[PDB]
Design a protein around this motif. Sequence first.
Motif, PDB file in Angstrom:
ATOM      1  N   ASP A  21       0.798  -1.201   0.000  1.00 16.02           N
ATOM      2  CA  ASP A  21       0.000   0.000   0.000  1.00 16.02           C
ATOM      3  C   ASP A  21       0.847   1.275   0.000  1.00 16.02           C
ATOM      4  O   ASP A  21       0.512   2.206  -0.725  1.00 16.02           O
ATOM      5  CB  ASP A  21      -1.001  -0.033   1.152  1.00 16.02           C
ATOM      6  N   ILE A  22       1.913   1.351   0.795  1.00 17.79           N
ATOM      7  CA  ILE A  22       2.767   2.546   0.727  1.00 17.79           C
ATOM      8  C   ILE A  22       3.341   2.710  -0.687  1.00 17.79           C
ATOM      9  O   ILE A  22       3.386   3.805  -1.228  1.00 17.79           O
ATOM     10  CB  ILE A  22       3.857   2.545   1.854  1.00 17.79           C
ATOM     11  N   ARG A  23       3.806   1.637  -1.311  1.00 20.16           N
ATOM     12  CA  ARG A  23       4.337   1.722  -2.675  1.00 20.16           C
ATOM     13  C   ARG A  23       3.295   2.184  -3.675  1.00 20.16           C
ATOM     14  O   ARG A  23       3.592   3.024  -4.531  1.00 20.16           O
ATOM     15  CB  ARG A  23       4.816   0.352  -3.132  1.00 20.16           C
ATOM     16  N   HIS A  24       2.080   1.642  -3.571  1.00 19.52           N
ATOM     17  CA  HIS A  24       0.981   2.099  -4.436  1.00 19.52           C
ATOM     18  C   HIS A  24       0.673   3.589  -4.246  1.00 19.52           C
ATOM     19  O   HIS A  24       0.427   4.329  -5.183  1.00 19.52           O
ATOM     20  CB  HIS A  24      -0.278   1.241  -4.189  1.00 19.52           C
ATOM     21  N   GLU A  25       0.672   4.066  -3.012  1.00 20.51           N
ATOM     22  CA  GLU A  25       0.360   5.464  -2.695  1.00 20.51           C
ATOM     23  C   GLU A  25       1.507   6.456  -2.932  1.00 20.51           C
ATOM     24  O   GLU A  25       1.293   7.664  -2.948  1.00 20.51           O
ATOM     25  CB  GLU A  25      -0.065   5.569  -1.227  1.00 20.51           C
ATOM     26  N   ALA A  26       2.728   5.955  -3.088  1.00 22.42           N
ATOM     27  CA  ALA A  26       3.936   6.793  -3.114  1.00 22.42           C
ATOM     28  C   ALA A  26       3.917   7.808  -4.264  1.00 22.42           C
ATOM     29  O   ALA A  26       3.421   7.504  -5.355  1.00 22.42           O
ATOM     30  CB  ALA A  26       5.178   5.877  -3.242  1.00 22.42           C
ATOM     31  N   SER A  27       4.464   9.003  -4.053  1.00 24.24           N
ATOM     32  CA  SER A  27       4.589   9.982  -5.135  1.00 24.24           C
ATOM     33  C   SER A  27       5.333   9.489  -6.385  1.00 24.24           C
ATOM     34  O   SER A  27       6.235   8.651  -6.279  1.00 24.24           O
ATOM     35  CB  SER A  27       5.347  11.212  -4.612  1.00 24.24           C
ATOM     36  N   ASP A  28       4.984  10.033  -7.551  1.00 22.37           N
ATOM     37  CA  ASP A  28       5.606   9.678  -8.832  1.00 22.37           C
ATOM     38  C   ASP A  28       5.924  11.035  -9.465  1.00 22.37           C
ATOM     39  O   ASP A  28       5.010  11.721  -9.926  1.00 22.37           O
ATOM     40  CB  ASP A  28       4.604   8.847  -9.662  1.00 22.37           C
TER      41      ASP A  28
END
Length: 297
Positions: A21-28
Motif C-alpha cells: 500500500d505505501i508503494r501504491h500510494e507513493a509519489s511519482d
Amino acid sequence: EMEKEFEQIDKSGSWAAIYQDIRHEASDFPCRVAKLPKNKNRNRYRDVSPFDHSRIKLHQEDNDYINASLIKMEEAQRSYILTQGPLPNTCGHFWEMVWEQKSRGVVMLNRVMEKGSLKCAQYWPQKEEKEMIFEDTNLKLTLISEDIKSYYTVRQLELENLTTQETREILHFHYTTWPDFGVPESPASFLNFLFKVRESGSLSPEHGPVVVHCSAGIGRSGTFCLADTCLLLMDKRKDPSSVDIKKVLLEMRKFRMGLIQTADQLRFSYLAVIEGAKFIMGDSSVQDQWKELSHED
Ligand SMILES: CNC(=O)[C@H]1Cc2ccc(NS(=O)(=O)O)cc2CN1C(=O)OC(C)(C)C
Ligand SMILES: [Cl-]
Ligand SMILES: [Cl-]
Ligand SMILES: [Cl-]
Ligand SMILES: [Cl-]
Ligand SMILES: [Cl-]
Ligand SMILES: [Mg+2]
C-alpha cells in the motif's frame, strides 16, 4: 498509535500488504535530468533516480547532475541528503556536493563490496599518509583519525577546497553490518549507531543536511532517515502517540523514490522507533543498554 498498530499488523501477518500500500500510494515525479543521455554514467542503477524537484545541483557549469535528493522534512525541521554510493567517476562530485551543501556528517550504511560486487567506490582515504585529490572538483581529502567498533567505524576526515584553502572537518559514520535488502541485527545496534550520529552534532540545524547513503540510497538510507525523523517528531512534541510512521514515510517519498525497500525494513523501522521512544521520553538508562546489547567493543 504505532505500538497498537504494530501488534495488529504482526497478529494479522500483514507487513507485505501494509508495505505494498505505501508503494501504491507513493509519489511519482519526473526525473528528466537523471535520464538525460549525458548522465547515464552518473547513475549506479537504471531504476533509481532523483526527482527533478528535489535533486541536489552541483554548482558547476558543466553538468550540475548528481544522483542525490534533498529530503526536507518541514514539520520535523530536519533535512537529509540521500544519495547513491558514489561511482569511480562521481567521487569528486560527491565531495563537491558535501562542500557546497555545508554538510558536517556523511552516514554510510553499506560496504564497498556486498554479495561479491562493488556497490560503492572507495571514495574516502583508508590511510592518513595517502590522501585523495579530486582534481575535477579541486578538493583534497585526508583521513585524520578513525575509531573502529565491532560493527561500525567513525572517521574524522578533513576536506580542503584547494581553490580557497579553506578546510572543514567531516565526520564519517560507517555502519558495516547492515545487509543489502536486510535489517540491522537489532533495534539496539541500529539505535546505538543513530544516537552516535546525533551526539556528534552532524544533524544540528547549524550545519548543512547530513549526507546519507547506502548503495542505491533508498532502502537502508530510507530506514535510517525514517527512524530518525519519527523520533525527532515525538521529541519536539514530547508525544509518541502523535507520530504516524506511514505518513512520515509517504512524506519523505515525495522527495526521493523507493525509500525503504522491503516490508521487513518497514517493520524494523517501527521496532526502532518504538524502542527509541523510551529514550526520548526520559528513560536515560536505555542508551547504555543499547550500547551493551550492540556489542560494539
Ligand atoms: C533487486 N536489486 C535492485 O533493484 C538493484 C537496485 C537497488 C535498489 C536499492 C538497493 N538497496 S539500498 O538502497 O542499497 O539498501 C539495492 C539495489 C541493488 N540493485 C542491484 O544490484 O541491481 C543491479 C543494478 C546491480 C543490477
Ligand atoms: Cl567497506
Ligand atoms: Cl562478498
Ligand atoms: Cl563502484
Ligand atoms: Cl549485503
Ligand atoms: Cl518501492
Ligand atoms: Mg597507518
